[PDB]
């Protein structure tokens, strides 16, 4: 795996890919 | 945090795993 | 607004759009 | 849960707001 | 619902989500 | 218009509803 | 170019790619 | 319409151009 | 067809659309 | 990481995320 | 190939790495 | 190359066809 520049909805798609049926929390600072 | 880091800097899929349930 | 079939990554994009700065949880076990 | 409401069945943007933090 | 910064294809995805089977027009200035 | 506003500024899902059929 | 099955939001991304600056209408009732 | 051509059946990028403004 | 500004994952989606079952190579410089 | 059903453009986004700077090939005939 | 592994069946991110250049 | 051009400049769907198999 390589480092990622992920902004906006692209970060949520990556979380979905990584976590799958395990689920995930999306929690931005402010 | 992660949201901020991945966007203003760079992050890895292994860092993202910290956010799974 | 309209009722959608929203699945897989599409469901997570929808949550991002709707929740944004508040953040969200995606927990398909629940 | 969310999958059952929004993927098997159909759901509104208002129902999706139930999953915001 | 929260305010949205939506550029490019991200704006069209949001329109699809909002309008659904009602359909929509995507009409950029220039 | 909407395309311009949502990108150069900010817009709401309620503004987007103005573009449905 | 090739023939694709294009559905839901994928169909709208395809219209954005193909039409761009011209804009498009998505009217699934029609 | 578009759904029938491009989703049930199969369609080309040229057919998609029919829906540009 | 119109000219495209395509960055990141948006370029890969366009390749998928253009090439389909023919497949494609995604090969960034550096 | 988890096992996903990944199809069509979703499979290509996954390859982009995983491969990034290395690039990738998408060859569904193979 | 990839479709059979990752779309009909199920595949891991590690299997996806087999298709990196 | 193509990746660089489409992002730092602009490119066409016909240029992208050069990358199909
Ligand atoms: Zn983007
Ligand atoms: Zn999809």
């Amino acid at each position: 795996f390589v480092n990622q520049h992920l902004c906006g909805s692209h970060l949520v798609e990556a979380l979905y890919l990584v976590c799958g049926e395990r689920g995930f929390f999306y929690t931005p600072k402010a | 945090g992660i949201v901020e880091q991945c966007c203003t800097s760079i992050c890895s899929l292994y860092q993202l795993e910290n956010y799974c349930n």
Side-chain angles (χ1 to χ4, degrees), chain A residues 1-8 11 14-15 18-19 22-29, chain B:
Chain A
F1 305 145
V2 298
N3 278 162
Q4 310 294 152
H5 184 235
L6 301 160
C7 291
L11 180 50
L15 285 168
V18 173
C19 305
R22 236 192 176 258
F24 71 85
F25 272 74
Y26 173 72
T27 51
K29 182 199 157 176
Chain B
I2 202 70
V3 171
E4 298 58 50
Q5 155 135 354
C6 290
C7 192
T8 77
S9 190
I10 232 80
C11 72
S12 65
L13 295 188
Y14 297 95
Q15 290 173 317
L16 290 187
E17 285 197 292
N18 303 332
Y19 295 83
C20 312
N21 247 76

